[PDB]
Amino acid sequence: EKHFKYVILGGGVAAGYAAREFAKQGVKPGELAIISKEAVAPYERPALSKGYLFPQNAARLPGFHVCVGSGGERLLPEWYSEKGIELILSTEIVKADLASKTLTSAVGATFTYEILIIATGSSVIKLSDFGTQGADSNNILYLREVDDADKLVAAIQAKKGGKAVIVGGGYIGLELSAALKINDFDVTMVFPAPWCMPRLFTADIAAFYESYYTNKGVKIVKGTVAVGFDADANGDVTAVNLKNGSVLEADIVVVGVGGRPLTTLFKGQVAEEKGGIKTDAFFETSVPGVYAVGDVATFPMKMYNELRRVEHVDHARKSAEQAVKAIKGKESGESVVEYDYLPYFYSRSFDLGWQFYGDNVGDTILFGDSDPTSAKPKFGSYWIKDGKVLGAFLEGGSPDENKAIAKVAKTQPPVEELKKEGLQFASKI
Ligand SMILES: Cc1cc2nc3c(=O)[nH]c(=O)nc-3n(C[C@H](O)[C@H](O)[C@H](O)COP(=O)(O)OP(=O)(O)OC[C@H]3O[C@@H](n4cnc5c(N)ncnc54)[C@H](O)[C@@H]3O)c2cc1C
Ligand SMILES: NC(=O)C1=CN([C@@H]2O[C@H](COP(=O)(O)OP(=O)(O)OC[C@H]3O[C@@H](n4cnc5c(N)ncnc54)[C@H](OP(=O)(O)O)[C@@H]3O)[C@@H](O)[C@H]2O)C=CC1
């Protein structure tokens, strides 16, 4: 049975950014352990749906270990061993006893902490969770961790030039439809919502992306869901049966239908709200000396005075750093600013890339060049509530333009023929 002052449970984005901050804060060899079910040190998870899948010059570990995704030093396993931070890899915690401050692995092994950081991230929802007919067929694939990405890369080779069906119209759906098309697959997306990213995108924004994908040869089947799968004698998928009675042939099915916080180890033992582990502005839970960061946290979102949960990478890095600062700030009992988070979301596929800052509430205005056939499409949108801009989206912005929309979202300037030179409004704020 192993004993550590600090234990990070999970080997993902938040764990790695917590590790870096601990080292910034003077953590001594022997004090810190990270326990992960993955076989590799903490990595920038966003690469898995993007550069990992390029047919040439793909992203691969150890390339995309944290913290290179935010422009920081790369933490190789040797970085951890040189600082006496122990990585306990290929270790799944099946039991967490917060009363005893003891964690037990699948193999029976035991681990104690004084301070615990929960950074267990999110599940990937699978059609097998629903009991859907034939969802156990081979080449029905999900994407959450690097092992998943390796199976997908392998299938992309094995099914070269074939048919892919992408189930879901959120982030994974967007990114993976584009990745499979760039790998020379015939690609069809299927989803129930009225339009892609249903969610953040307005009808105007969604119509741009839909048209652009159509132009790239991606087929789009809306208003339905997969209700079953055909499979051959080998158990390999051959087709997707849709609710409406149609059937799509498929060599590979990629499914992106959401994720949920991985919190079941702590059911009962901590307060929960909005589907995650409730925290204060320092990421401390119900149980003292127990923190929760990343996707699992439901925390106070100061600029909108609501608790929220966020399932994106920027928040994972920043919440991790906050936690380590708060832990140490009690040790040298000084004082720590409360987390003040500006939501920042983003996605890229094909040659496109957008950013969104703030809160997508209120009435919307579109601005700029919305032509899917433009050489470099550049357009955006503002969200306006109570006379103020609360949210801002921009596709194709420069660094100064993205900085300017972020400042709009942060300052909430009052507004109305903002439709205007829309982007110039942000650029002069
Ligand atoms: C493929 C993909 C691409 C994405 N791209 C983007 C993007 O471009 N932009 C963006 O904003 N967001 C993106 N996201 C969201 C972003 O990656 C997450 O918000 C972020 O990874 C959360 O970090 P975390 O530390 O909370 O969770 P995670 O990084 O998922 O880390 C969880 C860790 O806990 C381990 N674990 C869980 N339970 C146990 C246990 N019982 N025992 C041991 N280990 C355990 C997991 O295996 C893992 O190592 C993406 C997500 C995915 C899956
Ligand atoms: N930020 C980024 O650039 C990226 C983020 N990610 C993250 O990874 C995680 C998983 O992503 P993703 O899977 O795209 O999840 P999302 O929650 O972003 O999107 C999933 C979509 O699938 C819909 N859906 C639900 N059930 C079905 C169904 N049966 N058939 C078809 N569609 C369905 C969901 O609807 P509903 O919400 O109504 O249930 C939702 O619109 C998320 O936490 C996400 O934030 C992943 C890749 C890129």
Residue numbers in the entry: 4 to 418, 422 to 435
What do the authors of the reporting publication say about this deposited model?
Structural comparison of OsMDHAR to other proteins, using the DALI server, indicated that it has the same fold as that of putidaredoxin reductase (Pdr), biphenyl dioxygenase (BphA4)18 and rubredoxin reductase (RdxR). All these proteins consist of three domains: an NAD(P)-binding domain, an FAD-binding domain, and a C-terminal domain, as shown in Figs 1 and 2.
For more detailed information, we attempted to determine the structure of the enzyme in complex with NADP. Although there is no difference between WT and E196A in NAD binding affinity, E196A showed a 16-fold increase in affinity for NADP compared to the WT. Therefore, together from the structural studies and ITC experiments, we hypothesized that Glu196 has an important role in the NAD selectivity of the OsMDHAR.
